[PDB]
Amino acid sequence: LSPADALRVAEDHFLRHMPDARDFADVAKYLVAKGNLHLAAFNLHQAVETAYNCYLLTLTNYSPASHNMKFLRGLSEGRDRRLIDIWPRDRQRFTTWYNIMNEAYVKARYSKRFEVSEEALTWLQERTAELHKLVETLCREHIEK
Amino acid sequence: LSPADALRVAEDHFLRHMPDARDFADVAKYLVAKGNLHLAAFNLHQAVETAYNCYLLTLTNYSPASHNMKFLRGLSEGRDRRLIDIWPRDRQRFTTWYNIMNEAYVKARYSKRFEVSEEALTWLQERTAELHKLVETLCREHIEKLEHAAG
């Protein structure tokens, strides 16, 4: 509630959180190089969650505090339709793969098995990189002057 | 219940989890090089949690499923006193620093402020590396490779 404050606060959010998101995606790449695909999916999950958190905070000064994936994605696509392109459902395997990441937070550290191919991970990386590019753009476009 | 099964299962656990723990500690180093100290603390928290989870699974085929830190540490030190050396309280800053990591799972991704110095992180890295060395050793020492003598 105040033109100059609202700018300060939206800059603070975006600078605080977008770099966490980029870094999680980098950690994932690192872990793929290591051969630890399950923990890379976990980092991809975090890259994506953090990216949405960053989006919602920057543009509305609020984020759920569950930080639920479906929820934060829901809310974010609800605030700007351009974000739906990120996760196309024109092939089934795209949902299989996406669900692997979603399962990865809860499982992945803890389950005895957690199956994810190289191909799935390459796809989730491409998709995360577009989410990050777009989210970065949409956050800059929110410039109060 | 079964000498050869119990060995298979304890190897499976340790091989499944110890490498997650090492890898979290490595990720932390990587993030320290990147200048992202808050997320490195987060990975350190996971390196430690995963290490204790690995310990308790290997030796007892069970782990809480809270995966609470105080808890899993409590349980793990309760089963082998050697693990108390890992987190000495002979300086106050050691408790400040440890608490930073503990707070790091919950905060750190989410909070606006999360303060952790280079010195703190270096100390948490050294400590995590001893936990991992010790845990690795205690897991190998758990060998029912003898108790399947009765073949």
Numbering used by the authors:
A (entry chain A): 151 to 295
B (entry chain B): 151 to 301
Pull verbatim passages from the article behind this deposition.
Subsequently, we generated a new construct that consisted of the C-terminal domain, and obtained crystals that diffracted up to 2.7 Å resolution. Each monomer contains a six-helix bundle with three long anti-parallel α helices (α1, α2, and α6) that forms the major part of this domain, and three shorter helices (α3, α4 and α5) that stack at an angle to the long helices. The monomers are arranged as anti-parallel dimers with a large buried surface area of 1203 Å2 (or 14% of the total surface area of each monomer). The structural analysis indicated that the HEPN dimer is held together by contacts throughout helices α1 and α2; in particular, residues Asp173, Lys184 and Asn186 of the HEPN domain play important roles in maintaining the dimer. Asn186 is located at the edge of a loop connecting the α1 and α2 helices of the dimer interface. This residue, along with Lys184 and Asp173 of one monomer, is involved in hydrogen bonding contacts with Asp173 and Asn186, Lys184 of the second monomer. We found that a single substitution of Asp173Asn, Lys184Asp or Asn186Asp in the HEPN domain is sufficient to disrupt dimer formation, as verified by size-exclusion chromatography and analytical ultracentrifugation experiments. The structural similarity observed between the HEPN domain of VBP and kanamycin nucleotidyltransferase, as well as the results from our ITC experiments, suggest that a nucleotide binding pocket is formed by the dimeric interface in this protein.
Two additional proteins, among others, are also required for Agrobacterium tumorigenesis: VirD4-coupling protein (CP) and VirD2-binding protein (VBP). VBP is responsible for recruiting VirD2–T-DNA to VirD4 CP to help localize T-DNA to the Type IV Secretion System apparatus for transfer. Sequence-based predictions revealed that VBP has two domains: an NT_KNTase -like domain at the N-terminus and a HEPN (higher eukaryotes and prokaryotes nucleotide-binding) domain at the C-terminus.
